[PDB]
Design a protein around this ligand. Structure first.
Ligand SMILES: CC(C)(COP(=O)(O)OP(=O)(O)OC[C@H]1O[C@@H](n2cnc3c(N)ncnc32)[C@H](O)[C@@H]1OP(=O)(O)O)[C@@H](O)C(=O)NCCC(=O)NCCS
Length: 90
């Protein structure tokens, strides 16, 4: 699954632009707020949103940025299933 970083749309997304996680940067680029995840119906229940989240966390982590998990997929599903990411959380 090729996920890319589209800075201009503030998202990490599949190459076809169809599935994405959108963020807003806060505190002068120090905090990435994950605000909305969307996977289209035909591609759901297969782990795609999880891979989108991993792309965003790895990005935040390599750049020394912390995360706000505003999006309910992130706080309610991804983090509980992946607690080793919780130190990234603002
Ligand atoms: C939420 C969404 C991105 C998940 O995509 P996905 O690729 O199907 O997600 P994954 O396969 O990684 O994980 C599926 C898990 O998502 C969880 N989930 C589904 N909807 C959720 C929601 N709105 N909030 C918290 N988690 C949700 C379920 O627990 C599901 O677990 P299961 O394996 O027991 O069915 C996708 O269903 C979607 O685009 N929904 C509409 C937009 C939305 O409500 N986004 C959340 C707020 S930003």
């Amino acid at each position: 699954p090729k996920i890319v970083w589209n800075e201009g749309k503030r998202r990490f997304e599949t190459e076809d632009h169809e599935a994405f996680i959108e963020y807003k940067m806060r505190n002068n680029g120090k905090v990435m707020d994950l605000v909305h995840t969307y996977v289209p119906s035909f591609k759901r229940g297969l782990g795609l949103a999880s891979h989108l989240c991993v792309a965003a966390f790895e990005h935040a982590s390599s750049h020394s940025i912390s995360i706000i998990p505003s999006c309910s997929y992130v706080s309610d599903t991804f983090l509980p299933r992946n607690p080793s990411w919780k130190p990234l959380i603002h």
